[PDB]
RNA sequence: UCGCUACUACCGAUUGAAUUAUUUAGUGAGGUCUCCGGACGUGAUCACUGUGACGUGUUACGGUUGUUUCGCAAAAGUUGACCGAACUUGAUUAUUUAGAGGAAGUAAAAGUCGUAACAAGGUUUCCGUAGGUGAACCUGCGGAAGGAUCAUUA
RNA sequence: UGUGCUUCAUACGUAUGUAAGCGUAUUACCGGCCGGUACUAUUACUUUGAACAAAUUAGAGUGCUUAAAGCAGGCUUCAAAUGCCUGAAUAUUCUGUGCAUGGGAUAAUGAAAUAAGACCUCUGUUCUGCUUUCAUUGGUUU
RNA sequence: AUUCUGGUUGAUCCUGCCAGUAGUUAUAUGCUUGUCUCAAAGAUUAAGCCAUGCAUGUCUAAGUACACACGAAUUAAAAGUGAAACCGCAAAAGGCUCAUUAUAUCAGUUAUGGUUCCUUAGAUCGUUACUUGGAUAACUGUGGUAAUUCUAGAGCUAAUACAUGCAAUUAAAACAUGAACCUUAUGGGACGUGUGCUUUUAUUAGGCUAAAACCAAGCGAUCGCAAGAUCGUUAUAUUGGUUGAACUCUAGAUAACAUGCAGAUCGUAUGGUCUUGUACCGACGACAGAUCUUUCAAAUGUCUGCCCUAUCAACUUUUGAUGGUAGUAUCUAGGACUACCAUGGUUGCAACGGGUAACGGGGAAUCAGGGUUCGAUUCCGGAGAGGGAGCCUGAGA
RNA sequence: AAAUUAGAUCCGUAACUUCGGGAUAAGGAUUGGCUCUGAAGAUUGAGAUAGUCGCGAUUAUCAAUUAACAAUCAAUUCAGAACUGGCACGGACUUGGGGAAUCCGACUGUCUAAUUAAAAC
């Protein structure tokens, strides 16, 4: 099969090592995943001793985690924008580790004003001319049960300018942090502070 | 794993710390992977036919151990080749034997018939205190008996006496510069007590200096060092007389030359 | 070194540039810890205010020293965070009872915490996991430190 | 030197011949993986049909039914990759071998021709270098004594 | 930094071969001369070690009748008799590398030059930092 | 058991080789041979081919037994022997050989905190019928081709094989979320909800020297008539951890995750309790269970050590060579593989190439020492089964 | 006579040799269309901080830019990838067959306008 250790592959002087141990199983390699953005496939491969890992060709959904929260909301995966290993992997939309990715931005925002009821980032006020009627069904204060906890915050609720602009579009930049050919999933964190400003300078200034 | 794992083992390749003869067969007892390692074992074809001479063939040992007459550490152990290493109390209540495997000063082991009252507990050293087994704490023993919920002052490099009916600690003997010890594994095998000083080499292989009752100061690795009590404290019964660090000619002068016959 | 000049975001694993959610109120705003390998090796101050990441550094990366600690003199320092050392010894031959002089070269990873590593400075190295194909050693202490004759100049 | 009788090893047209491994290119059996595929064999609904039951409005049991909804896996075959045997060609080595002719060597003294050297070997010898000559050899130029002078000549 | 003296422990007025006292301080504390104890320019060499297969080899012990072998056997004793006794050495080897420890002769490198020299002028001019207390918990800050 | 003699001359002293000399677990061969104890033996040339025969199979009172094949008696308990067949395990060890192989194997040393692992022992097992579904061998029955090897079609039937499935999975307790609670504070609640392990991602603590000057709640406590003002005690930087350490490590909590896995099993006894009524519980073992710790190992990597050759002096790098970087892939490190940068890396201390009648080492032959020659060969390690390549199942090829 | 080869890119290339060569040696691979991707330039860079007077017009600057500084603008060439059809792709055209030797003349040059271009001069 594909082999993974140096039976071939000449030495540090430049010299050809000759033959070396006909071909052994324990140094095998496998054909890759190339997990596209097709919805829902997993093949599982029987690995070294007794085990199994999940070769997840064609995934579509991922357990993404806003790292500055301690939250991890599952979304779907929309676009594969940037990748440092290649551009053959961007263009064919293949998911491997840290591809910069675009997810949903919605299951975080509903989680955001659940615990951090402060409305931001706010959309166009022509839509916001009336509520149904949210600001009392948010907290209502009870005089006084569990819920004054929503106002010794507002120290947390000033998420940065370059992230709240990316929430109003309803799609946010994230980053894969799993091994989709191995772990069977494409999870990850999202770009917030300076991982953001690097990977976004990489896009709009290059074009 | 590379087409392993080597179920056979040859005579003149099993150690001569079990005193096997070069003729007598091509093969060797090959202990079946118990608590103790292979080179630190005495498989129960050795202890029954070669030593106690209860048998005379190899077939006359499975006609002993399968009837549950043998009893290693309180449990039965009908394995015909169970490893049964250091201080494993083979408590034969029939026919009332009560051994313990303690190692001789000549690098070898010695048959030591012990008292039946102190047979039912044995002394064993600790290796790694760690979390994770129930609930948080546990330590691993030199034979590997993991025992849960220990004393928080038993660190590594110490020994605890384990009762053979329970699996519970009753006394700990910790590693200070006043405690007599015992060596198992090197050239200094069988020599008993007492500690002087330990040279800590950071990363790795600490050695320690041991002074015998003859004033015979010597040294060995900290891996080989068991511990069997404080100063002039035999907490277990020892075999023949302590492993004095006999001279080479004195054993040829004690009983070989000075011989009544 | 060079400040994010790669295609990927060169970042230290397991550290977080986050402020919003934190149990307690415990900031202190110097967020990267350093390993200290503690084998007699005082970690330099630039492994604390270090802008480099170096995933192969033993103080600020996921390698840890174990095994042989050797010594050697630098001869070339031209690879990217990687040097090669000279290790000079003698091989005794017994049908002449004279010595025969040999040497070996070791491809050695040089952490960027050691500014200004030159030949022929003396270097104490220490064994690691296979870092790249021939490297199995990190520098631990470059044994020149000051300039005892090359930063010396009269008046 | 030459001549007869042998023996070994060279040079050589043939752009000779036979291997031996190692590869460039080319084709290419199989297989892993993958894109589809969906024999047969169920699930299962859609209706129901055989009967009874309730209020014929509805249901219970049978027809491997009618036949549409909805799956579940799954063989053949397939698309693409990847390992790659294998033969065909080229080059590269590393050996072995046939060759008209040519030319050295050895053994073989007993052949022919002359006498080169060792005695001041009858032209002292030897060396380096060039040319010449049937052959040993000869001659020039330079050197050396391993010379036939350790030299006596204010 | 080589020893000298003063010595005393020690082969016979003689002999220190173990050591102690002057060359201004061969590492600071407490313990009862003695232990914990802070501190070690370097490498080669060398001392003793550690550490590691057996067979072989060296070879200990032993009447297989002897022998090369063998790892047994022997005894009380012609016995009855878990009735005893001890075996089944120690080493070259697996020479070197690498580690621990003693040494510091020999042999290299090292240092202080118009001083980025040392202790000092221990000045606070400069520091770095963070766990203890600001009931809890926040601000003012030594 | 540190030694030499003959042979250049008419005789001499030498240099010098030739010839003698002896050992060889060292091969063949020649002649002869009365015992006897041990005993090497298709390695050399052909790792060139091979008639025949055999070298891997296995059952306990304890996975399944409908055989009259044999046992007995109307008891399903037959618990007998159990053929077959299924299932479980093993067939990856051993045994043979030396073609390949020149820092490669190997030897020693050290590593794996860069991994993985059947077994073995040890510890461990709550957050809607509880007792189940169908379908095949053995068995019966009829068949096919030159051909026994091969196998179809039908009728039967099992399980520790395959599949589903816990009403105590049971909550209080723990603890978010609301909730019939409602007070100038190191302050309080019925209940509705939710909280297996494992994988994955993410977060936060992570092993730690001492106090006040001053200050808002003035609660503990004090004073001012008080609005209150000055202060202040401890439980509060509360997890093993190598005792070399941001071990991403074994532990824990938080926010999720998807998708699986989760004891419908078996022999010997049964009595405590009889209403002989599924009200009442031992000792054992297992196709098996899962996590952690061990163990038989492996596989990589560290530092040194290998024969002949310069009529082999420069090699490597298009097509990975040396490094960086992100990935993939693998059990895991890693140019192992990809993509992008950097231009490195080895070398007269012999690289590279070639040869080898080269498997490496323990060891063997022979000497006073220093040594030379050999090791296909019973032990450890590597390697391979006519030549290459591929691969399935399996913890392991 | 005719056919074969032919452009270009890449790899590779022997005997001899006047060391210039031979050589385009020989021998092979690639080549269309369509969608993107990478690389190779130029020119001003871009200026951050009172308010008199009523932000508006008269109205500031050493340097650090920087590691893609940001837009504009400019030509064209070269590498890469994916898909894609009767392998037809240098699709017409333009466009070398090669090699082993022998003889003569060294070479480029010249000649018998109208039968000899050579080895002749």
UniProtKB/Swiss-Prot annotation, chain A:
Keywords annotated in UniProt: Cytoplasm, Lipoprotein, Membrane, Nucleus, Ribonucleoprotein, Ribosomal protein
Record region (Disordered): 1-22
Cellular component, GO, one term: small-subunit processome
A single GO molecular function term of this UniProt record: structural constituent of ribosome
Gene3D superfamilies according to UniProt: 3.10.290.70, Ribosomal protein S8e, subdomain (1.10.168.20)
Domain of life: Eukaryota
Feature: compositional bias, Basic residues: 7-22
GO terms under biological process: cytoplasmic translation; larval lymph gland hemopoiesis; maturation of SSU-rRNA from tricistronic rRNA transcript (SSU-rRNA, 5.8S rRNA, LSU-rRNA); ribosomal small subunit biogenesis; translation
Its membrane topology: Lipid-anchor
Localization (cell): Cytoplasm; Membrane; Nucleus, Nucleolus
Keyword Ribosomal protein: yes
Family (UniProt): Belongs to the eukaryotic ribosomal protein eS8 family.
PANTHER family for this protein: 40S RIBOSOMAL PROTEIN S8
Subunit-level organization: Component of the small ribosomal subunit. Identified in a IGF2BP1-dependent mRNP granule complex containing untranslated mRNAs. Part of the small subunit (SSU) processome, composed of more than 70 proteins and the RNA chaperone small nucleolar RNA (snoRNA) U3.
Role: Component of the small ribosomal subunit. The ribosome is a large ribonucleoprotein complex responsible for the synthesis of proteins in the cell. Part of the small subunit (SSU) processome, first precursor of the small eukaryotic ribosomal subunit. During the assembly of the SSU processome in the nucleolus, many ribosome biogenesis factors, an RNA chaperone and ribosomal proteins associate with the nascent pre-rRNA and work in concert to generate RNA folding, modifications, rearrangements and cleavage as well as targeted degradation of pre-ribosomal RNA by the RNA exosome.
Descriptive protein name: Small ribosomal subunit protein eS8
Source organism: Drosophila melanogaster (Fruit fly)
Curated annotation (Swiss-Prot), chain B:
Domain S4 RNA-binding: 42-104
Molecular functions per Gene Ontology: RNA binding; rRNA binding; structural constituent of ribosome
Disulfide bonds: none
Xref: Gene3D superfamilies: 2.30.30.30, 2.40.50.740, RNA-binding S4 domain
Residue intervals passing through the bilayer: none
GO cellular component: cytosolic ribosome; cytosolic small ribosomal subunit
InterPro entries listed in its UniProt record: KOW, Rib_uL2_dom2, Ribosomal_eS4, Ribosomal_eS4_C, Ribosomal_eS4_central_region, Ribosomal_eS4_central_sf, Ribosomal_eS4_KOW, Ribosomal_eS4_N
Superkingdom of the organism of origin: Eukaryota
Annotated keywords: Ribonucleoprotein, Ribosomal protein, RNA-binding, rRNA-binding
Single GO biological process annotation from the record: cytoplasmic translation
Entry keyword annotation includes Magnesium: no
Tagged with keyword Nuclease: no
Recorded family membership: Belongs to the eukaryotic ribosomal protein eS4 family.
Protein name per UniProt: Small ribosomal subunit protein eS4
The species this protein was found in: Drosophila melanogaster (Fruit fly)
Gene: RpS4
Curated annotation (Swiss-Prot), chain C:
GO CC field: cytoplasm; cytosolic ribosome; cytosolic small ribosomal subunit; nucleolus
Pfam family of the protein (one): Ribosomal_S17_N
Any one GO biological process: cytoplasmic translation
Gene Ontology molecular functions: rRNA binding; structural constituent of ribosome
Keywords in alphabetical order: Acetylation, Ribonucleoprotein, Ribosomal protein, RNA-binding, rRNA-binding
Entry-annotated residues carrying N-acetylalanine: 2
Key word Zinc present: no
Family membership noted in the UniProt record: Belongs to the universal ribosomal protein uS17 family.
Name assigned to this protein: Small ribosomal subunit protein uS17
Organism: Drosophila melanogaster
Lineage of the organism: Eukaryota, Metazoa, Ecdysozoa, Arthropoda, Hexapoda
